From a paper:
The domain I to III module swings 15° toward domain IV, closing the active site. Domain IV contacts with domain I or III changed markedly less (~100–200 Å2 buried surface) than with domain II (1000 Å2); domain II-IV interaction thus mainly stabilized the closed APN conformation. In the closed [name], the side chain of a phenylalanine (Phe893) at domain IV was placed at about 4.5 Å from the hydrolyzable peptide bond, whose carbonyl group is coordinated to the zinc ion. The phenylalanine was located in the loop that connects α26 and α27 in the single domain IV ARM repeat of human and pig APN; it penetrated the active site groove in the closed conformation and locked the peptide, ready for hydrolysis. Domain IV residues that precede Phe893 in the α26-α27 loop contacted domain II in the closed [name]. Domain IV-based superposition of the open [name] with bound RBD and that of closed [name] showed a shift in the domain II main chain region that contacts the RBD; this region collides (<3.0 Å) with the CoV tryptophan.
[name] (APN, CD13) belongs to the M1 family of zinc metallopeptidases, also termed gluzincins, which comprises enzymes of medical interest for infectious and autoimmune diseases, cancer and hypertension. We determined several crystal structures of dimeric human and porcine APN (hAPN and [name]) ectodomains, which reveal the dynamic conformation of this protein. Each crystal captured a single APN conformation, with all the monomers in the same form. These structures identified three distinct APN conformations, based on active site accessibility, which we termed closed, intermediate and open forms.
Numbering used by the authors:
A (entry chain B): 63 to 126, 130 to 963
B (entry chain A): 61 to 126, 130 to 963
Write the structure that this text describes.
């Protein structure tokens, strides 16, 4: 560990200035069936401190000494002793016979070769059909640490430089990169069948934002209001069919919106958006060349759903948000990832709302992010938004940082921050921040300084403490408080929300798990004065003290990142209001009441009957979010109980509650022919239909059967509205047999819209026949049938089926080596797989099997799913206790109310 | 522990031998303050000293003593002082250390007083319970075999140590007391308390401890004196007797006893033979001399509600138990390593006795699907064992319990039938009569049997053998396994080799006979019998009997009388196939089954291409008889276990639908739309299988039938419209098609069932649900004695595991509840072994093997008791399954697709 090349962080002795990179992809296999790329690069770097070793990143590259070292101007150049590759720390190491001089620059040259693999990382290959022709293209994904997989570089985000990219490609293919082309392409001297395309120099930026693509893709375009050229690229067929039109509608105006909102121009002449058939995450914010999954950019007005449409605008908005938060201004290191991802996850709502103002999509942050992340942030094995820099060291640890904490808690905490500052004041602070650190890097402390500057120049908004004092507690310690109110005395208290008394908190907090909390409140339907709970375990205020015929609720619209519990009497008054006139309570807080009480019940802080009682009013609820809250909450109940005697009465209860909503949606939609007008009501319909069919409501089963029967009789004319397809497809396959399954499989393999393929993949997992589900699992590891990008999500879908649960858990264990080698170093997929197949575990036996699984595979380890496994273990232990203590009361409650 | 001390060895010393026992027992049929049911006892055993010893070692298990022993002399005997007494739990001994040695040639009497629990554990003196109206009834009953006599009173508890027994029962004055013998005089009030009475019984014959029985209950009886003067009584719950459920047993029991008496020229020596049905009982029945005990589904019968299969079970189990009166009771095995001398014989001559009571059934043929091919599946393993194992291998109680298996019962019956067949039963029974007369009230080994059979052979001329009886039968008895006989019909070349599954099969049990057999070979050529042949103990021979012209075919082992399987060259196989296609009638029906059985078994062991076996099912399209279809169903059952979670399953079910549909349609017509059963037993069995197969593979006509009838039953539950023969299938398929409504209805019927036959069909059918939550809830019930009797717990678990959806549920269930399962059944005949086998049957992957290995490792501390060999066989079979599935799955998939 005393040798620098055996440590995961680079030395500070050398800093890069600029790169020349030329890459040449071969889109046809050689004799060994390998797709390869060849490359050559020159990096210019400066020596800051004397050193006799050059340490630079290199991953899965073969060198054809491995480097040539030259000097810039004055520099005296030491001889190369030897060069070696250190694979563990992913280094190319150049041992010298003498030291480099400080203040002096050097240029290092290399020639290399790597595989154009189907692994979705570095420079990789993507494939599709066009008619009967197999097409292969070359594309990139550098984040987090795979730029090193395409050329040797100082591969850390803060070490910014300019890049001069050249692509050598077949003369009838299009070459794309971050910047526009520099002049025209020229024929490759040795062979005019190839062309050479040089691109303009990049801005000072991070290695992980580099991109370059060689394909036959086509585009549509428009110049945006701020003069920036927007293009939408995709497979020729998708463009011809008009599937890029929607992205073109929204991209430019959203880019222009952010520039104005943050008073900071986008400094590139273009922003390309491109849809790839093979892609790991949802998208990637490469500066000037934003890459996308097809289901995140393309859109078919006749075949895509309102949900698909919403995904497209928010992912685009998210990626464009990064152009400021990530690209222009970049985290100093991955331990501060939320500076990138937290902001993009919040700012995406702002951008998307600008493009689709009628949706009220800003409200979707509460189910989508706030309560999404609280499930994990309640664990002792969570982590704070900003982790200690030394905890984030290996590539696996970096990958795992891309989680619901960095994204969703980051967005939630930032919304709370915006809300008590006002967005007007917030964006002034952010503008100051962006201008000051443009083309550089930041930490969380830099953010506070510019927000504080804004608050101090300003007299209308007042705070109980400095921005840092308040925000350090939401940022540097994990978790969140439960705020408890005694409405008889107005006593208000706070404590760290934890699942168990068993929960063993070992991460020490310098802030003693106390927060400064912004508390809004509403009494008898009328807004009260704002209040700030200081960093103390308890306080008192008459705002929270009620008369016996009054009621209060705190955290209006759940702007604050916390949950609320009341005394039993105030809960009863809330319940009575929801029966008498639920309109008096804001719709989001109707959801809150369900979310919080179930979550409290999960942690045995309130009786379970409280949570269940809070769903009784849903009988007469039409609106999206309170129903969403109940479905999300009872989803945990299903996972715990859908293999027990509780399941029968639970479904009976759900049938009873949802039937009136189903009937409501049967009439207003005119027998399902006319969709509801606005987004929320369309979402409401989708959930009602899903719930009705999921819980066996006969009217829904017959609807699904009839529609799917009709489709099979006329395959070219799909009679099912896109909004309804996921439920109709699933229920019909569940009701049906092999005829339905094989039909849908045929539709899947010929699908020409990814949205539709996505729905088919999920519905196929709904079979009630073991042999079909197991045969399906077998397909997931066959790239001809299921793309690698979709393998884990399909496995998770099958595991969600109660009959598929043991099949998938067995499958995952038996195929672990392949699954780990393919995904175990990546973000999202691997972690989601582990969380997915272990969600149900609620017995000592299941826990022992998880522990045995862990022991069996310890030597290799669990890579970017290491924290996921720990959380999986903690949550199963908690589930064991909760099921044991809750089963009897829950069973009886369902029986009595159904 | 110190093996130099006799109280630390499992076998008793031979220094002391029992003469007679006095045993007084008093069951308390109401619990004490702690909720314990107990029994109190007093016993005196008289024994002789054969050789000088300063220690008395006697068996004792779970008894509390109130030293623990008083030792007295008979007349002259020099009586040593007792130094001290101790209980050694591991070897289940009461140990009396003496000052100086007992005197050889002289007798002693040893008295003890003791207490034990009347547990619900089905062993020793235990309790059984049932409802009568709204009153909970409790009774006391016994089960001593293999070695729980010691659990009721201290005794020399080994089968060869016979004695007479004077039993006294102290019981409530309004309950009936039964034992082996009739009462001696009247009952008398208990002196201290006339609410109790005292019943002394007549002295038993000289017999083994494991045959003792005594019962205290409210039961009633029907009776009849048999043709041989013996009183027969049928005992059961008062309500069962009142409804006439004991009548069929009364019809057949006496005649079967008289038949055996005459057949073996050996009279039954006791004045009575009681048969009694118990609500709680481990095995099928037990042959206690004078008081035969039974599961209710083995003795009782309702002509309106029981099936023909239920009927066949009753008469064959009774015949089996009565068979034991000679083979087991009168003449007893010397030690448990020769168990087949008891059980092989009872499993064979049960067919003879049942055929006497029901001669129209032709039930003797049922030995082929029931015993021969049943046991071959396991006897194909390196981890099998011979009929007679080395005595030193059968030592502990777990090992003794383990011997009660398909080898000792089913291979035993098969080999004995083979023996009977080549001696002729007339000659056989003459040798057996000589055997019984010579060893009456004593004990035997396999060698004693050959000697008397040989004497019969030598005293005649018409029947010829190629060697001594011992030379032939030692090879079938002392080494495990069986040969595959392979013939090249172009040359007449015939050869034999030990049948094993894999090329990795690791046989470590050495054979002094080099795994060669002397084999009786019958044959048929183009439908006409050929001269008989014996293959000698040689790996290869040649005979023109087995050489055919290209126009001819031959088949060996007519009616599968011999315990072996047969393979032919491909051209002879093709000729057989052509015969089956052209005119199947030319081939004897049992041999049509054999063709299927053998070809699938060879396919399983990679000895023939799988396509051969599958091709041999193509003619079933036009087959109407029971046994060839049974062969296919039993054979494809393995395919189902291997493939019902794979892409093969769809095409497999499709093929089976296609094949069974004409048979379904045949019976729909013949039975006049299912209203009239076929006349004979075999055709009734064929209908049952046709219906089961059609529904299980999703034939829509059958599915419609089951839903319609079950809907009709639910609309009028007191008038069940489903004929008993069809209930198992109809119930199952309706439950599978249906939901919670059907399940809860069936559960209600089960918990109010007054007939165990019906309860059994309901239990099995409830396991057919396709809803995980219903199956898992059901599993929870199986360890609740209020809902599922302990006697039915493991069979119910096995039914659920057979459901492809229930497989992971039951495997997890068994693993997570193993501690309770082991201490309840691990000691422990039939149930425990069956449970391990049932839940692991499907394993065919490296992952499943690893999981089974880990399971083994996890519980090695306690061990696996009477399921130890079963676990080793499970592991061996899993390993073979991995290889077979890997190498067969492609050909099997393509075959089913093409032919469906
Ligand atoms: C598949 O193979 C089988 C043979 O294994 C074929 O069956 C044979 O078919 C023959 C042609 O019909 C038939 O023919 C002739 O039979 C009777 C005499 O039969 C009686 O005695 C003999 C010997 O004892 C039979 O074994 C005996 O058995 C059978 O029939 C009984 C019922 O009556 C039994 O109940 C039954 O179980 C058993 O099958 C039988 O009792 C003669 O009367 C007959 O003469 C008449 O037909 C002649 C024309 O061929 C003649 O010219 C006329 O003048 C006169 O009307 C005689 O020819 C065999 O009996 C029969 N064998 C067996 C064992 O059944 C079967 O046909 C074939 N299947 C196909 C599709 O080809
Ligand atoms: C990539 O190309 C750019 C643009 O030509 C180069 O940037 C120049 O670098 C030189 C040498 O240090 C400077 O003197 C110029 O001011 C830069 N030109 C500009 C900013 O227009 C850069 O050196 C190249 N990168 C390399 C060679 O690694
Ligand atoms: C059980 O009772 C029998 C029959 O009464 C006893 O058998 C007698 O035993 C004596 C003493 O050895 C013999 O001399 C008689 O011949 C036996 N009578 C018979 C066979 O009718 C037997 O002793 C008793 N068992 C005991 C006391 O343990
Ligand atoms: C990199 O490319 C630029 C533009 O072609 C060129 O001027 C420069 O010399 C190259 N840098 C080197 C060779 O270090
Ligand atoms: C890299 O080198 C290794 C070892 O020579 C080889 O296995 C691999 O195929 C090479 N990859 C290339 C040339 O892309
Ligand atoms: C990171 O940014 C700071 C300015 O906030 C700058 O001083 C520092 O040099 C940067 N680090 C690197 C490696 O360029
Ligand atoms: C329920 O409360 C709302 C206020 O949000 C009010 O508009 C409505 O009139 C109330 N309902 C009734 C029946 O008055
Ligand atoms: C056994 O019982 C019989 C009958 O009561 C009695 O004659 C005999 O003495 C008893 N044996 C003893 C007490 O050893
Ligand atoms: C035997 O004695 C043990 C030790 O106290 C006791 O636990 C058990 O209940 C007793 N059994 C009886 C009295 O049947
Ligand atoms: C067992 O039977 C043999 C005769 O076959 C006999 O000699 C021997 O004494 C018996 N053993 C015992 C313990 O009675
Ligand atoms: Zn992002
Ligand atoms: Zn028996």
């Amino acid at each position: 560990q005393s040798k620098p090349w055996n440590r995961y962080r680079l030395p500070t002795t050398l800093l890069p200035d600029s790169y020349n990179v030329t890459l040449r992809p071969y889109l046809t296999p050689n004799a060994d069936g390998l797709y390869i790329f060849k490359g050559k690069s020159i990096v210019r770097f400066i020596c800051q401190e004397p050193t006799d070793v050059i340490i630079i990143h290199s991953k899965k590259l073969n060198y054809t000494h491995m480097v040539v070292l030259r000097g810039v101007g004055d520099s005296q150049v030491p001889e190369i002793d030897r060069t070696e590759l250190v694979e563990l720390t992913e280094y190319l190491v150049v041992h010298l016979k003498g030291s480099l001089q400080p203040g002096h620059m050097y240029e290092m040259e290399s020639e290399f070769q790597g595989e154009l693999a189907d692994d979705l990382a570095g420079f990789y290959r993507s494939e599709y059909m066009e008619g009967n022709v197999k097409k292969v293209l070359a594309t990139t994904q550098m984040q987090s640490t795979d730029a090193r997989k395409s050329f040797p570089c100082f591969d850390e985000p803060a070490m910014k430089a300019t890049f001069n990219i050249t692509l050598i490609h077949p003369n009838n293919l299009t070459a794309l990169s971050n910047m526009p082309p520099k002049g025209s392409s020229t024929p490759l001297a040795e062979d005019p069948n190839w062309s050479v395309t040089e691109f303009e120099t990049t801005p000072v930026m991070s290695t992980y934002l580099l991109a370059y693509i060689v394909s036959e893709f086509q585009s549509v375009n428009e110049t945006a209001q701020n003069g920036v050229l927007i293009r939408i690229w995709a497979r020729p067929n998708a463009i011809a069919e008009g599937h890029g039109m929607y992205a073109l509608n929204v991209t430019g105006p959203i880019l222009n919106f952010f520039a104005n909102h943050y008073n900071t121009s986008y400094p590139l002449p273009k922003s390309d958006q491109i849809a790839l058939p093979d892609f790991n995450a949802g998208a990637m914010e490469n500066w000037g060349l934003v890459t996308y999954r097809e289901n995140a950019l393309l859109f078919d007005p006749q075949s895509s759903s309102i949900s698909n449409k919403e995904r497209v605008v928010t992912v685009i908005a998210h990626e464009l948000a990064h152009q400021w938060f990530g690209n222009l201004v970049t985290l100093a290191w991955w331990n501060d990832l939320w500076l990138n991802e937290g902001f993009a996850s919040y700012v995406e709502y702002l951008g998307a709302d600008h493009a689709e103002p009628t949706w009220n999509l800003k409200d979707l942050i509460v189910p989508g992010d706030v309560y999404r992340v609280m499930a994990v942030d309640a664990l002792a094995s969570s982590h704070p938004l900003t982790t200690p820099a030394e905890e984030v060291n290996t590539p696996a640890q970096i990958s795992e940082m891309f989680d619901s904490i960095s994204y969703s808690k980051g967005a939630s905490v930032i919304r709370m921050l915006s809300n008590f500052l006002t967005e007007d004041l917030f964006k002034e602070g952010l503008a100051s921040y962006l201008h000051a650190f443009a083309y550089q890097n930041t930490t969380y402390l830099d953010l506070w300084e510019h927000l504080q500057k804004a608050v101090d120049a300003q007299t209308s908004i007042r705070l109980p403490d400095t921005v840092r004092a308040i925000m350090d507690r939401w940022t540097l310690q994990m978790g969140f408080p439960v705020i408890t109110v005694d409405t008889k005395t107005g006593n208000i208290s706070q404590k760290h929300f934890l699942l168990d008394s068993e929960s063993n908190v070992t991460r020490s907090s310098a802030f003693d798990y106390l927060w400064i909390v912004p508390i809004s409140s509403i009494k008898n339907g009328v807004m009260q004065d704002h209040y700030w709970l200081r960093d103390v375990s308890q306080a008192q205020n008459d705002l929270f003290k009620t008369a016996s015929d009054d009621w209060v609720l705190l955290n209006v619209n759940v702007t604050g990142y916390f949950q609320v519990n009341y005394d039993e009497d105030n809960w009863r008054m809330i319940q009575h209001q929801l029966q008498t006139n639920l309109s008096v309570i804001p719709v989001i807080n109707r959801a809150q009441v369900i979310y919080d009480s179930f979550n409290l019940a999960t942690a045995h802080m309130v009786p379970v009957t409280l949570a269940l009682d809070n769903t009784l009013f849903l009988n007469g609820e039409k609106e999206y979010m309170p129903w969403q809250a109940a479905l999300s909450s009872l989803s945990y109940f299903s996972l715990m109980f859908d293999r027990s005697e509780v399941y029968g009465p639970m479904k009976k209860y759900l049938r009873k509650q949802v039937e009136p909503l189903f009937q409501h949606f049967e009439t207003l939609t005119k027998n399902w022919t006319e969709r509801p007008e606005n987004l929320m009501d369309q979402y409401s319909e989708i959930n009602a239909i899903s719930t009705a069919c999921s819980n066996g409501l006969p009217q829904c089963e017959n609807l699904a059967k009839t529609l799917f029967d009709q489709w099979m009789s006329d395959p070219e004319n799909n009679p099912i509205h896109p909004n309804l397809r996921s439920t109709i497809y699933c229920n019909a396959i569940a009701q049906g047999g092999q005829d339905q399954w094989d039909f849908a499989w045929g539709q899947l393999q010929q699908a020409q819209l990814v949205n539709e393929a996505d729905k088919l993949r999920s519905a196929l997992a709904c079979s009630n026949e073991v042999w079909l589900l197991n045969r399906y699992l077998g397909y997931t590891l066959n790239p001809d049938l299921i793309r690698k990008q979709d393998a884990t999500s399909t496995i998770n879908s099958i595991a969600s089926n109660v009959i598929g649960q043991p099949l998938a858990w067995d499958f995952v264990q038996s195929n672990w080596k392949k699954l780990f080698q393919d995904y175990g170093g990546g973000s999202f997929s691997f972690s989601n797989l582990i969380q997915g197949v272990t969600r149900r575990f609620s017995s000592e036996f299941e826990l022992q099997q998880l522990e045995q699984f862990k022991k069996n595979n310890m030597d290799v380890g669990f890579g970017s799913g290491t924290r996921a496994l720990e959380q999986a273990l903690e949550k199963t232990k908690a589930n064991i206790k909760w099921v044991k203590e809750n089963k009897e009361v829950v069973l009886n409650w369902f029986i009595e109310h159904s």
